[PDB]
Amino acid sequence: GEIAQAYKEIAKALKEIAWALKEIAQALKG
Amino acid sequence: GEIAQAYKEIAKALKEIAWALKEIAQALKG
Amino acid sequence: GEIAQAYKEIAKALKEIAWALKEIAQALKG
Amino acid sequence: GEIAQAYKEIAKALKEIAWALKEIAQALKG
Amino acid sequence: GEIAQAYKEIAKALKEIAWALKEIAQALKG
Amino acid sequence: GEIAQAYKEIAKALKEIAWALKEIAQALKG
Amino acid sequence: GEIAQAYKEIAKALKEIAWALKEIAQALKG
Amino acid sequence: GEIAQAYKEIAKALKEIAWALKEIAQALKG
C-alpha cells in the first residue's frame, strides 16, 4: 500500500541520516 | 493520495538532513 | 486537507533543520 | 481540528530546533 | 482528546530538544 | 488507550534526548 | 496491539539515541 | 501487517542513528 511504502521511504531516509553520522565519525577519527 | 504524498515530502526532507550532515563531515575532513 | 497540510508543514520544518545543519557545515569550513 | 493543530505544534517545535541549530552555527562562526 | 494531548506532549518534548541545542550554542560561545 | 500511551512513551524518549543534549552542553562548558 | 508495540519499539530506539548522546557527552568530558 | 512492519523499519533506522552516534562518541574518545 502507498502509506506503508511512504513509511518505508521515511525509514530509508533515517538510514541515510545514520550513514551521514557514520561519515561524521570517520571525519573526527582523521 | 495527499497523505502518502505528504509522507514522501517528509522522507525527502529527512534525506536533505542526511545531505546536510554529509556537508558537516566534509567540513571536518577539511 | 488540513492533516496533509499539517504534514507538509512538518516537512518544511525538517527542511529548515537541514538548512541550519548546512549553516553549521559552513561555520566549520571557516 | 485538534489533531491537525497538534501536528502544526510539532512543526513549530521542529522550526525551533532549526533556530537552535542556527544559534550553534553562529557560535562556531564566533 | 488523549491522542491530540499525546501529540502536544511530543511537541513539548521537541521544544525541550530545541532549548538543549540553544544551551549547546551558549556553551560553544563561552 | 494503548496508542496514546505509546505516543506518551515517544514524548518521554524525546525528553531523554533533550536531557542528553544538556549533558553535551555541560561537557563543552567544562 | 501490533501498532502500539511498533510505536513502543520507536520509543526504545529514541532512548538508544539519548544514551548514545550521553556517550558523546562523556567523550567530550574526557 | 504492512503498517506495523513499516513502523518497525523506522525503529530499526532510529537504532542505526544511535549506533552512528556511538561511533561519533568513540571517535571523540580517540
Residue numbers in the entry:
A (entry chain B), B (entry chain A), C (entry chain B), D (entry chain A), E (entry chain B), F (entry chain A), ...: 1 to 30
Original authors' sentences:
Despite the requirements for aliphatic residues at a and d, up to 40% of these can be changed to other side chains without compromising barrel integrity. We introduced mutations at one or two of these sites to generate four groups of αHB: Group I had entirely hydrophobic interiors, but with different sizes and shapes of channel; Groups II and III had polar uncharged or polar charged residues, respectively, at specific points along the channel; and Group IV had aromatic residues installed in their channels. Finally, seven Group IV designs incorporated single Tyr at a or d sites, or Trp residues at a sites. Finally, one third of the designs were crystallized and yielded 12 X-ray crystal structures, all of which were open αHBs with fully accessible channels. Conversely, the FAs generate signal through interactions with the more-hydrophobic and aromatic-containing channels (Group I and IV).
αHBs are oligomers of 5 or more α-helical peptides that assemble into coiled-coil structures with central solvent-accessible channels. We targeted two properties of αHBs: oligomeric state, which directly affects the internal diameter of the channel; and the identities of channel-facing residues, which fine tune this dimension and introduce different chemistries. The αHBs are loaded with an environment sensitive dye (in this case, 1,6-diphenyl-1,3,5-hexatriene, DPH) that binds within the channels and fluoresces. Accordingly, challenging the array with analytes leads to differential displacement of the dye across the array to give a fluorescent fingerprint.
